[PDB]
Design a protein around this ligand. Structure first.
Ligand SMILES: [Zn+2]
Ligand SMILES: [Zn+2]
Ligand SMILES: [Zn+2]
Ligand SMILES: [Zn+2]
Lengths: 261, 48, 68, 157, 71, 299, 49
């Protein structure tokens, strides 16, 4: 309301300021059908995203708000949308009012409107599956994000807790030092889909660090979909919440038979 | 040259005047009926 | 019903062929398919071009075209 | 007949030079619009098409107002403009009809091209479109026509 | 470009250049470390051969120390 | 709705209708006005409100970023001009063997620096130290107290720069070398001999420099160039400009060396007269002095 | 050519360009012949590429 509904959305990147459509050259000749580079080897292909979402800054009314659009702007999340207030999709953190609109729709496709698939991708990356309502992200690749600063093991979690708290309500955040990776679980799936594209290829630097001028030189972190939590301290919480979900559905379902009779 | 692309019409051709065409001298007395319209692109196109 | 196919400015066509000079964006993916799908029709366009070639007496010849 | 000043082209009539400075100014705007402004968005590319349909509309609307609303050009000039492609023969003719005087495009009226046999939206009056916005409880979900971007050619608007 | 899959070690470690460059020469050791480690445990029975191959391992592993030492 | 009410509604759209709403580099400007050719250009470092342009007519004409004022007082061609950041001072240097200071406040010569042997083709103002760095056909760099002379290469010194950290002075000469100077020790810290005459250099606003030659523009802590026989300027946007003597303006990226554009200037109302002598960016615009007696603004 | 006549068929009611014009995807305009040739060369190279 005061932070979001009061203002209008702002142009994040100028349309001249947008990156070039060709990728960085990792081959000898450019391929025109498949917009990639062909001959020779294939190098790396991952780079730090130059752009990042400042959520309390860039949120505002847009064109999709008056139209009743259901879906969020993909390049609002990357910090890359050049249309600003003239864009057909939404430019704000998903809320309970917003996911209530997506409730019939979230089952088969994400908050960005892209269709979910049958099974997960091999590296658990990408959009996701409709078969599992996954609400947990695997925050990985943290060394290339931090530009190989050491720091400690719990300060890394402090960077994770500050950044992902702006991207929605959180169920829990777990960091594992031995695996150098984090597990962030959200209240809703739509926040998790939103924060996944928001934090792909980003860096946890906070310009109070000395490498802030060299934030671009790194690799960038991987936010991917999480697998199941293998400890039985969490497994028993899964079937406990699945039980409560089933009891909340049966009360709703006997009222269908009450009206059916 | 095969190296250079085919040049754009609106920049390099549209502005220039064309050139004279291959029109015969044409008589004024013998060819009076036809000299008005013999070399039109579509001859007598609007003559009802 | 029916009408007489609309007449379009020349600048509308010329913008299109200027825009598809270097096509590397993601928006061009359907249009990339369209060029391959038009390849079967291309000897027909060559016939309609070489039969409409200007004869020696005329400087320029304005033909009527149908474009995607 | 061709836009090129061929030898075949009949020379200009008398009142032409009084309106040649505006007509050249429309011409140089058209040359700028076709320059391959390379963009990445599909929303930006068709806006570049929308500017071209706007400029060509504005030129023919000016020639229409000179001959019909002001009668400040001769008929020999006005036929010379149409034969030398400066104005659209058909788009002017639709403007003469009582419904279509502020018409967007020849493309917009055509029933055939669309999915259902309808004109495009930018042919509907806004006050009617405001009415379904009152009905649905939702502000009007139209901004620009796809094949030009018009915002109401509607005669009432 | 320029692959790093073509050239040699190159022989001296100290003569190599900026850190983003020696990183890829370093993994250009580790793959042959990985490849010939898998070639250790094989039951292929040539005991003379795997002895000279064991010395090549110790050579490359010492190089791997040296590339880490330069960094 | 009524026809009068519907009339007052139809004006509420912004344009007249029907589009009325409900709810690389290019050449922007050409400036003539110098009588002779224009050798050097510098811009006001604080406000960006003016230019200081030298000439071959010995004058200096302050152009609005219109012509504000003329600064005479040199007897010969003004090869270099530099404006100071922390001072309201302008250091001009010419072919008359003198480095002349200028008080921008009152517009009069304050100081004249002496003991150069021959024409002085470069002035660079050291940022922190209140120093002047001049270099010339004298084959030496003279550090002026606004003190030190540096045993130079072996030939005339074309371009000189200053930086606050070590290697304070970067110098370039027609012996095809580029030296990095340790001024307190007053001897060479490092020599860069990879150039095959280096006529121009430019400091990136990354702590590096872009070095020029006839056919190869290098960088120093390459750039892909064909035959562009020989000024350089580095925008804060990475883009690295290159002025040619064959009229070609070679625009490049200082990250992939890639050359994304090459332009060609229209000479004037001779074909040999169309080079670009000097060039500079503001503190999104490019200001290039040419030997056709004109200043061109590239947007 | 005159010994073996091939007679045309009368049920060919769909020409190429007539049926092809009917679709929403094509539009119609008039331009110079040389411009038509240069567009076809630019398109035709772009297809084979
Ligand atoms: Zn957007
Ligand atoms: Zn229209
Ligand atoms: Zn329309
Ligand atoms: Zn319209």
């Amino acid at each position: 309301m005061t932070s979001w509904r009061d203002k209008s959305a702002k142009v994040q990147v100028k349309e001249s300021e947008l990156p070039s459509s060709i990728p960085a050259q990792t081959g000898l000749t450019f391929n025109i059908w498949y917009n990639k580079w062909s001959q020779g080897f294939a190098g790396n292909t991952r780079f730090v995203s130059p752009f990042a979402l400042q959520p309390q800054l860039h949120s505002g009314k847009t064109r999709g708000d008056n139209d009743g659009q259901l879906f969020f702007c993909l390049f609002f999340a990357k910090g890359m949308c050049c249309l600003g207030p003239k864009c057909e999709y939404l430019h704000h953190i998903p809320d309970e009012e917003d996911i209530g609109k997506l409730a019939l729709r979230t089952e088969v496709l994400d908050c960005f409107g892209r269709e979910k698939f049958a099974d997960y991708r091999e590296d658990m990356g990408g959009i996701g599956s409709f078969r599992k309502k996954n609400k947990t992200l695997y925050v990985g690749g943290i060394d290339g994000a931090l530009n190989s600063k050491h720091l400690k093991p719990a300060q890394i979690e402090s960077r994770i807790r500050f950044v992902f708290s702006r991207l929605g309500d959180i169920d829990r955040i777990r960091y594992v030092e031995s695996k150098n990776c984090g597990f962030v679980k959200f209240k809703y799936q739509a926040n998790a889909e939103f924060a996944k594209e928001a934090m792909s290829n980003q860096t946890l630097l906070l310009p109070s660090d000395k490498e802030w001028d060299d934030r671009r030189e790194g690799t960038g972190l991987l936010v991917k979909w999480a697998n199941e939590d293998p400890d039985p301290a969490a497994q028993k919480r899964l079937q406990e919440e699945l039980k409560l979900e089933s009891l909340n559905m049966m009360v709703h379902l006997i009222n269908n038979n009450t009206n059916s009779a | 040259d095969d190296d250079e692309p085919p040049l754009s019409y609106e920049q390099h051709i549209e502005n220039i005047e064309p050139l004279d065409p291959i029109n015969l001298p044409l008589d004024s007395q013998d060819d009076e009926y036809v000299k008005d319209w013999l070399y039109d692109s579509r001859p007598l196109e609007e003559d009802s | 019903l029916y009408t007489p196919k609309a007449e379009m400015p020349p600048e509308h066509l010329r913008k299109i062929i200027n825009t598809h000079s270097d096509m590397a964006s993601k928006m061009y993916n359907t249009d990339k398919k369209a060029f391959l799908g038009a390849l079967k029709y291309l000897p027909h366009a060559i016939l309609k071009l070489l039969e409409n070639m200007p004869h020696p007496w005329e400087q320029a010849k304005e033909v009527k075209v149908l474009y995607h | 007949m061709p836009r090129i000043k061929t030898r075949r082209s009949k020379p200009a009539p008398d009142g032409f030079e009084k309106i040649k400075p505006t007509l050249t100014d429309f011409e140089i705007q058209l040359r700028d619009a076709q320059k391959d402004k390379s963009s990445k968005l599909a929303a930006k590319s068709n806006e570049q098409l929308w500017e071209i349909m706007q400029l060509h509309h504005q030129r023919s609307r000016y020639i229409y107002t000179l001959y019909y609303k002001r009668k400040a050009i001769s008929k020999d000039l006005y036929d010379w403009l149409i034969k030398e492609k400066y104005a659209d023969k058909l788009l002017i003719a639709k403007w003469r009809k009582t419904g279509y005087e502020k018409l967007c495009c020849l493309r917009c009226i055509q029933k055939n091209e669309t999915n259902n046999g309808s004109t495009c939206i930018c042919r509907v009056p806004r006050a009617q479109l405001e009415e379904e916005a009152r009905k649905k409880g939702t502000q009007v979900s139209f901004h620009q026509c796809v094949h030009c971007g018009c915002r109401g050619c509607a005669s009432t608007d | 470009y320029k692959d790093y899959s073509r050239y040699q070690r190159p022989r001296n470690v100290s003569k190599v250049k900026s850190i983003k460059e020696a990183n890829e020469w370093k993994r250009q050791v580790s793959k042959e470390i990985k490849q010939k480690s898998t070639r250790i445990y094989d039951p292929s029975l040539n005991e003379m051969q795997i002895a000279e191959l064991n010395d090549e391992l110790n050579n490359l592993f010492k190089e791997w120390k040296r590339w880490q030492w330069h960094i | 709705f009524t026809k009068s009410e519907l009339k007052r509604r139809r004006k509420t759209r912004k344009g007249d209708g029907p589009w009325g709403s409900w709810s690389p580099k290019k050449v922007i400007r050409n400036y003539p006005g110098h009588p002779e050719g224009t050798t050097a250009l510098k811009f006001l470092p604080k406000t960006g409100h003016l230019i200081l342009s030298g000439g071959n007519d010995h004058t200096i004409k302050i152009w609005d970023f219109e012509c504000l004022r003329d600064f005479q007082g040199h007897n010969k061609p003004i090869k270099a001009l530099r404006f100071t950041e922390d001072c309201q001072s302008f250091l001009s240097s010419s072919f008359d063997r003198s480095v002349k200071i200028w008080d921008t406040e009152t517009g009069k010569v304050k100081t004249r620096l002496h003991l150069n042997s021959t024409p002085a083709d470069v002035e660079s103002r050291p940022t922190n130290p209140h120093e002047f760095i001049v270099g010339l056909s004298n084959s030496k760099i003279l550090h002026y107290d606004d003190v030190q002379t540096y045993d130079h290469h072996l030939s005339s010194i074309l371009a000189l720069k200053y930086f606050p950290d070590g290697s304070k002075f970067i110098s370039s000469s027609e012996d095809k070398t580029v030296r990095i100077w340790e001024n307190q020790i007053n001897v060479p810290i490092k020599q860069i001999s990879d150039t095959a005459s280096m006529p121009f250099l430019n400091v990136h606003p990354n702590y590096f420099c872009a070095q020029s030659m006839d056919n190869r523009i290098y960088s120093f802590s390459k750039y892909k160039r064909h035959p562009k026989k020989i000024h350089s300027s580095a925008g804060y946007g990475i883009s690295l400009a290159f002025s040619g003597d064959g009229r070609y303006i070679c625009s490049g990226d200082s990250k992939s060396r890639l050359f994304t554009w090459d332009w060609n200037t229209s000479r004037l109302l001779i074909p040999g007269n169309k080079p670009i002598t000097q060039v500079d960016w503001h503190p999104s615009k490019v200001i290039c002095s040419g030997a056709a007696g004109k200043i061109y603004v590239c947007d | 050519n005159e010994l073996h006549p091939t007679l045309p068929t009368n049920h060919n009611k769909t020409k190429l360009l007539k049926s092809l014009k009917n679709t929403k995807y094509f539009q119609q305009t008039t331009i110079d012949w040389v411009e038509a040739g240069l567009q076809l060369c630019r398109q035709g190279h772009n297809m084979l590429n």
